[PDB]
Write a protein that holds these residues in place. Structure first.
Motif, short mmCIF file in Angstrom:
data_model
loop_
_atom_site.label_atom_id
_atom_site.label_comp_id
_atom_site.label_asym_id
_atom_site.label_seq_id
_atom_site.Cartn_x
_atom_site.Cartn_y
_atom_site.Cartn_z
N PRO D 457 67.02 45.51 32.77
CA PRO D 457 67.20 45.45 31.36
C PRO D 457 68.62 45.05 30.90
CG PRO D 457 66.47 47.67 32.19
CD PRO D 457 66.65 46.75 33.37
N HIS D 460 68.65 41.01 31.24
CA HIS D 460 68.07 40.66 30.23
C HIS D 460 68.91 40.43 29.06
CE1 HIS D 460 63.79 40.99 31.93
NE2 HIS D 460 64.23 39.95 32.20
N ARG D 464 70.17 37.34 26.87
CA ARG D 464 69.81 37.24 25.44
C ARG D 464 71.06 37.10 24.70
NH1 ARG D 464 65.73 41.68 26.67
NH2 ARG D 464 67.31 43.10 26.11
CL CL Z 1 64.39 44.63 28.37
#
Ligand code: CL
Ligand code: BG6
Ligand code: BG6
Ligand code: CL
Ligand code: CL
Ligand code: CL
Ligand code: CL
Ligand code: CL
Ligand code: CL
Ligand code: CL
Ligand code: CL
Ligand code: CL
Ligand code: CL
Ligand code: CL
Ligand code: CL
Ligand code: CL
Ligand code: CL
Ligand code: CL
Ligand code: CL
Ligand code: CL
Ligand code: CL
Ligand code: CL
Ligand code: CL
Ligand code: CL
Ligand code: CL
Lengths: 502, 494, 502, 494
Positions: D457, D460, D464
């Motif tokens: 998480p 990512h 992002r």
């Molecule tokens: Cl995520």
């Protein structure tokens, strides 16, 4: 006045057919405990309405319906709460004469299962099988080989599960070989080796009271606990079936199976998960650290006639062999060899024809020396699994009133007083858990061996005549030597009072 | 039913004479709590047969015997067992009118006292004198100076003890001054600074339940305890006695004294001995480590009229000054700065005109994360000192029956259900303990200081108008902000 | 390379005069330890430059200056840095001949101090008096009564302090009498009962290493500690002074005073404050909980002649009474009766004419049973107060290298390797602390009583001839029975130290 | 000096033949770490005298023997004791040029292998096959499918084991896919996932120092430990090869693997047995309780050119994509959700182009408030895995001398000062343990998953562009924000 049957039938059980085969249906256990438990699970609406209880015994049954309504039904309990349902329930039970040796009879069993499995009107065309083997140990492997051959369910068409009742050998060598004898016959997952103490309400709460509460969790180690006492007491003797007991004895009958289980949950470390094997793994892990019982650290008894004469002597039984030395009573001091239980004495007590009926666990904490000195005494957490289901922590508190003195007191939780729930018989839970596939409250092979390995050397010493078996009056507290040994073993508290007791 | 009173008065008091002077005998406290407690100690046969209770107040009396039988006696409680004894008892009480500044009136109180212990027919000459000062704080030092001058007992002819009632100043500076004002007048041993909570049955068991039991001893530290909550709740408000309250406030009236007392006992280390001086030493030691209450870590309230209108607003009192901001409710988060209570939140709650009458202590243990997760919740040891005196440990157990589920339960001990004994009023124990000379259940001067030093900065911030005082309807749970603050402070609802 | 004298003299000592009277100045202790320590405190610039050290002894010495420069000065140590200062220092020491019983000789002492205080070029007209009583126990009360009568300082003109030396009676009754004998004479505040172990570098760190560190604080209880061993070892015997020792014995000489001190600081609870009495209160509190030494829980020795002939037998001393059974060696197992030290064995060892010179404290932690089993052994925190001042924690670690094996190792801190500082003699600290008024490192009366009460019953049993005194070779490990008793008492680890030892 | 090589090769490896295939023999890792470790195991006489090291690569060699003595041999270390053995050793290494996808070349590899075990003069038939896959992640599954097809040892004729090197995907989804891609190809037992950190001398003692010693066992919980810090520091940057690091980043390259590994060992509960899977079970069990890293509880950096200019900026690399935001530095605050590590902050630090080279573990104990107050400070157990192998416990002691003052000190144990032994390179232990079949120091598939699930998480969020990547001068201490965050995270800089 009968309570209705709700649909508590677990969604798994209400898709494929159900067949509960009770092998040894005529036998005393099946009449008294199995069939009655099955009635209560039906009344609870926990069994499918179209379930098939098949009685497979040797008896040449003339009128099955008479035996069903008069013998079998006479043992059902709640009848002021579920008496009307006796009819509808009994309609599901069918009997089948047959032998525990002839493959033609097991085929005839497969035949009858399918004839009543095919009759199912549900979603899945398979069928599930649960086999309750309440049969003598003399025919066990026969039936296991017979059922595994021609009585199993086709693949992807249902499960087969086996409830294996005790005895499980006389010692570790005896049990080991029996466990080998079943290895090809069934996968351990299918085997459900039943110990009924794992179905008692208080015995089940051992894991919750121990790993849900920080209060008990922080205290469950050598630093806070001074002694642990597991007690089995029975007012009744062998009386009738003394002939049977002579070959078993108090250690093999209760201590090795029932109380070593109490002991495993009491001593085990916090399970990885609440999974069946995660729980079972810790149970075996701790019994693997139990030092085997040494003969010098134990007291044995054999009951003699009561003062009143109403209870006879153990040997005063025609079935009891002449000049027997079978212990009807035993007190043991066990040691768990790990960093948690190092030093902590484990006093296991068990006896028939004693002063009272009792099952309780006693977790006696260290004595708090200062600032109260003699004005105080060891606290103990007491869990009584029978007669009255209760849990109470004994403390020391100020004498209530206009005075500066102390008194011992309790922080009690009495189940009968606090809950309006009519608690189930050990066997209702177990049979139900087995239908669901919960291997947690069932003895694992290794877990069973781990248990036999504790007592086998002591058992052998006893059988070699190396250990003295003291006589005690039926209905008394037991032999004097035992209470002294308990004191020496590390147990304290002045709460041991009868006319006899001190 | 009416039975003979036994002569079980302690052998210390048996030898010499006894005189219990109740200064401010007309006063509300004496007529409601002091005199009634003295009746019960007499009925227990804990006071000598020939004891002398002397009332001394500014009030002028026409008929003392009428005030004795109608006013005074109307407050006595057990009368279905002890009702007959009211006569014999009242016969011991005598009244005298006097100023709390005129030395002549003091020379008059002493002369009465001399003559009483001159009428004693026991083993030793002279007498013992216990002075209960249930008088306004406005005249306190006046009476202390007066009694110390001409009302004392000659040396080797008895003891003099002073039961000093509260308030003890408005802050630490005020209290300091007052304690210095008494230093020459009396030796600390003679002073018996009374906090009545120390006489409550459950408050007394705090020391025993903590240091007699290994079960609670092993758990009484930061490793096992997640949060500690002391709660005071009162269904009644200020009522007519609101003017008096405005100058005091909920913190000074209950928190500073009574609840810091429970706090001291709850947090203290195991006493060296069970001696008076050994127990009190640990009490002061721990309050000396309490961090002073910071204004940002507290919630204050002041009650509005109830929905029914039966309870009027606090401000709706003629005695209550116009536009007052006096807190009738307070919730505090205190911190004990030692290796036992490091991190452990101490949530102290106190309020008038609330939903219920309540005094309880809540020792909330750490949450046991695995293997039960959400199926379990923090254990709590609950000691309720009033209404029903009970002690119960909250615990998680398997749902009884044919289930693999959990349920919260408790291991009770309800004193009303378990004991047949009619438990004494806090004041019976205290007065009795003071006659014996047990300084344990009495506030020490350093103990008083240590307590004041916690709240004085907060109290001052409040009085400077720095802290907001939220409104709450009379009879409601209190302000919303408070319950939220309690959650933030570390307490978990259950 | 002569290190100059800085003004690091405490502000109290500056304003008023200073007089350090060394009663029994001719005596062995004064010439060997007192006077040398006073030189070092002068050199450090801790004593006023205008200090007055007065030697009050019975000796009728002719050339005081010769005894000062040849006898006294011969005992001063740092002379490669402080050798030049010997002159300036010795100029402050003055001698006086006088009785310990005639008051006229005490008035004559007062007289000389008065003349000295009348020569003080400082702010206040009075003067401070420290009296070091390094005199026989035979004349102690005589001097105390004499000094209290006519040798005290006028009110509001200076303090009087008394450094009192060992012995403090034969037992608790003897000591009680003596303490009562001093009660009217001086206020306890003035009395500075000296035990020199509280002056040793490692002995002082006992309070810091225990209450400054969470690592040791969390472990200092019955749950983590399996055994505690206090060891006194001396390579030398009684040599010439066997006569002096015969009346005292190893328990009264080292076990009662020095090692019970080490014991008090090892066992005490965290002090309320770091105040003198706050520290001393916890010391008294813990010795009040020590159970008195029982004769059955101890081993006694008396050194025989060595194999090499170099060390003659204890009795082979003309001063040693014929057929004396005086113990030169003792090992005992003590028990602290409180919730911290419940169960923890306290093994106190002490002996003369042994295998090595040693002072060390051994805190042996519980054995960690699983998962390492025999691959591991009890950890022990070792604090060695002499020979090399060091602190080391013994631990089990993986054999370094390309291996999957274990080995015992140490996390050592060696004070002579790490710190490159010339640590003071026990007596420098104490005398200094006494000038400042720090009653912390001085025995309190209750602290003295609490100590005597441990050994008095054992001492009496010994003196009644009830306890056996075993013979052992001078320079060996001690009697065989002792090492066995230590094993039985609860002490472990495979220390095969010597040819004799194992 | 030059002495005899003993035949101390384990009795299992003796009976049957041995073939160690180094797939990716041309590669940087094999020539720098694999081959050199192989030499040392041979010199140790831990490998059979007749062992067969086969280099398989796509690269082409004109003179294998020249690359063997000049390239390969140039990387061997102990040569003042083992220099003579270079000859005899090199005589065992053989090479082959082959693609990592064409089946012919895999039949051609197998071909060599059978013939080598055909030449064996020992007791047992066939031969054992260890495949070291030090090849790009771009060709991994191609070689796994190729080896599993062709060059597999026949059953009852020896074992086949795969030392798989990292990376193991770029997230939990990526890794999952890859692990499923290998499920049919090989049984987990054959797979040896290498995280070389598990071969470091101090990393190995983590299990012994905490479960053999009562001293550390009793302290290894929330009650005694205040904070835990895992530090990776590197003086060097990405240098010439940066574009390769751009796709990985500091979290994926070091933290996710190496340091989560230390973290597992530091936090795990006492293993049931010292068995391989008993140890590995507790490792996964604890990473299964680690809460996934949240973006708000972390600091990221990217090195900028040094003040001296000697170290160029990270982006100042032609291989580094234009306008990249790849973190070269990360500091994380992790939380283990169990009753042992409840509340204890876990500060994981990692960065390239920093002030020093460092690998250390810091177990900072609670501050002991009274009676020493500020005169004391948090004790800390420090395990430094590199540069100098050392373990030292930090504590407070009295200032030695004529003083009543305190000072910080250490109870040192410096492996270079205490032992005269030339400790092996992480890879010597691992390769050896793999030949023996000890799956303990190798990453398990569930272990791998449990690890990925912590950072996926966060990783990512980073990718992002949700997490800020702060700039810091190469060779400095790192970004200022990081040291502040560490203080806030609970680390009290001793
Ligand atoms: Cl995520
Ligand atoms: O808890 P109890 O017995 O009600 O005592 C609390 C009392 O405390 C007193 O300080 C107040 O004057 C009262 O108003 C209050 O009621
Ligand atoms: O062996 P060291 O110096 O501790 O470093 C570990 C190295 O391990 C390698 O496998 C990683 O690719 C590097 O990113 C890391 O630096
Ligand atoms: Cl074992
Ligand atoms: Cl009760
Ligand atoms: Cl109840
Ligand atoms: Cl056997
Ligand atoms: Cl507020
Ligand atoms: Cl808080
Ligand atoms: Cl009430
Ligand atoms: Cl109750
Ligand atoms: Cl009330
Ligand atoms: Cl202020
Ligand atoms: Cl005692
Ligand atoms: Cl030394
Ligand atoms: Cl070493
Ligand atoms: Cl060393
Ligand atoms: Cl060192
Ligand atoms: Cl005696
Ligand atoms: Cl653990
Ligand atoms: Cl979870
Ligand atoms: Cl290095
Ligand atoms: Cl390196
Ligand atoms: Cl070192
Ligand atoms: Cl170094």
């Amino acid at each position: 006045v009968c309570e209705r049957i709700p649909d508590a039938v677990s969604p798994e059980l209400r898709s494929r057919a159900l067949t509960i085969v009770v092998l040894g249906a005529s036998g005393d256990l099946a009449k008294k405990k199995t069939f009655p438990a099955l009635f209560q699970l039906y009344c609870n609406g926990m069994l499918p309405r179209d379930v098939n209880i098949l009685g497979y015994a040797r008896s040449t049954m003339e009128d099955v319906e008479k035996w069903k309504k008069d013998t079998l039904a006479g043992f059902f309990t709640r009848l002021d709460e579920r008496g009307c349902h006796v009819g509808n329930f009994l309609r599901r039970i069918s009997y089948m004469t047959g032998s525990y040796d002839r493959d033609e009879d097991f085929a005839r069993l497969n035949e009858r299962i399918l004839r009543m499995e095919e009759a199912f009107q549900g979603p899945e065309k398979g069928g599930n099988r649960l086999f309750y083997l309440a049969l003598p140990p003399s025919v066990f492997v026969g039936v296991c080989r017979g059922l595994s051959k021609g009585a199993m369910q086709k693949p992807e068409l249902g499960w087969v599960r086996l409830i294996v009742e005790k005895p499980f050998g006389r010692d570790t060598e005896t049990s080991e070989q029996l466990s080998n004898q079943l290895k090809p016959l069934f996968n351990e997952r299918q085997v459900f080796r039943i110990d009924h103490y794992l179905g008692k309400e208080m015995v089940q709460n051992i894991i919750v009271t121990r790993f849900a509460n920080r209060v008990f969790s922080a205290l469950w180690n050598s630093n806070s606990i001074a002694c642990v006492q597991i007690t089995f007491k029975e007012k009744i003797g062998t009386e009738g079936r003394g002939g049977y007991f002579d070959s078993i004895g108090i250690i093999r009958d209760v201590i090795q199976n029932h109380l070593t289980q109490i002991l495993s949950l009491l001593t085990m470390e916090k399970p990885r998960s609440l999974s069946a094997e995660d729980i079972r793994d810790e149970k075996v892990q701790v019994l693997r650290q139990v030092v085997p019982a040494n003969p010098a650290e134990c007291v044995l008894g054999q009951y003699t006639a009561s003062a009143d004469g109403s209870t006879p002597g153990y040997l005063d039984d025609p079935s009891v062999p002449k000049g027997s030395h079978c212990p009807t009573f035993a007190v043991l001091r066990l040691h768990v060899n790990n960093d948690r239980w190092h030093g902590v004495p484990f006093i296991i007590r068990a006896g028939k024809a004693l002063e009272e009926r009792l099952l309780d666990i006693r977790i006696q904490f260290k004595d708090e020396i200062r600032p109260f000195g003699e004005s105080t005494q060891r606290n103990e957490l007491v869990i009584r699994a029978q007669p009255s289901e209760a849990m109470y922590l004994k403390l020391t508190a100020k004498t209530p009133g206009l005075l500066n003195d102390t008194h011992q007191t309790e922080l009690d939780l009495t189940y009968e007083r606090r809950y309006d729930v009519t608690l189930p018989d050990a066997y209702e839970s177990l049979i139900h858990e087995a239908l669901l596939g919960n291997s947690t409250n069932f003895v694992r092979v290794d877990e069973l061996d781990a248990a036999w390995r504790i007592y086998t050397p002591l058992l052998h010493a006893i059988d070699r005549g190396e250990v003295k078996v003291l006589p005690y009056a039926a209905g008394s507290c037991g032999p004097e030597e035992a209470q002294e040994f308990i004191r020496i073993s590390g147990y304290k508290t002045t709460n041991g009072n009868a006319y006899k007791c001190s």
